[PDB]
Amino acid sequence: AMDPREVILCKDQDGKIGLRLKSIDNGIFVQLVQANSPASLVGLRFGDQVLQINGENCAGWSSDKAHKVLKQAFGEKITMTIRDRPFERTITMHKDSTGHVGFIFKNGKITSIVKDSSAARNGLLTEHNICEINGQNVIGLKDSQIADILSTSGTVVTITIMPAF
């Protein structure tokens, strides 16, 4: 759907980028993006795949290797080839009489499925992070804020999710 795209960025005054990368299946993934950082400024998100760092393929790099590669890098014009959230998946649920789609969450992660709900009928999975509800990003938000977003939404609740890491 989205072919890998190019991203260029600079280390901040403190020498940081705002990224925390995770090694999954001989590929590198964005595990954390600090707010108001170079990573967030260029559009990096939790779930994005880092294919290349400075023209070098990241295939089979350990997490510590990726972090050290970024540490040693020249603080200016750090390039990257990103593959937008490969494990992302969309699921549409419907609110019941009581105004709920039927699942429990903790730190933005789905923890349980309520019996006879839209989450149960649609097959929502547990141990999945909620990325976006009806278009707005919910990563980094407080649980109370996700709950507020869910109540202001209409009957049709379309969420994007991905396996947790």
Next chain:
Amino acid sequence: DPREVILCKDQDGKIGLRLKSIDNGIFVQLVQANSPASLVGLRFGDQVLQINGENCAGWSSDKAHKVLKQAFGEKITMTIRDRPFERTITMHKDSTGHVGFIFKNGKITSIVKDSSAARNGLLTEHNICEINGQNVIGLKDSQIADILSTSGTVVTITIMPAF
């Protein structure tokens, strides 16, 4: 998006299926060739949302097998969601005519340095499901290799995490 399918139990009271409990959901792990499941279009990695109008959410691998074993009569209803963990990746063949991955039993086991698989971030422990639209699950490695060589420079494949 999901679809309702209707199966008929075979000669032995079996449906030709094996299911796996992944993250409080039910998934098709194996489909036997020429069986009631194969006929309706059930494939590996498909999600079983309901059996006989019952939400499969939370069911163990054992519970879902028991439900099917002790199912009432000849006809069985199922609500299915087509391969949720399916993802499509595109590679390009080099001078030697290769994209850069080693596979065994239809599963990607290694990525070759300085290749299109490496550049594209292709993941290991992933089953290949389709090569240029053509299904490859059930096929022997040589038939998969044969279809890989038949393709042009552009190799588009669908894959899913191995389970």
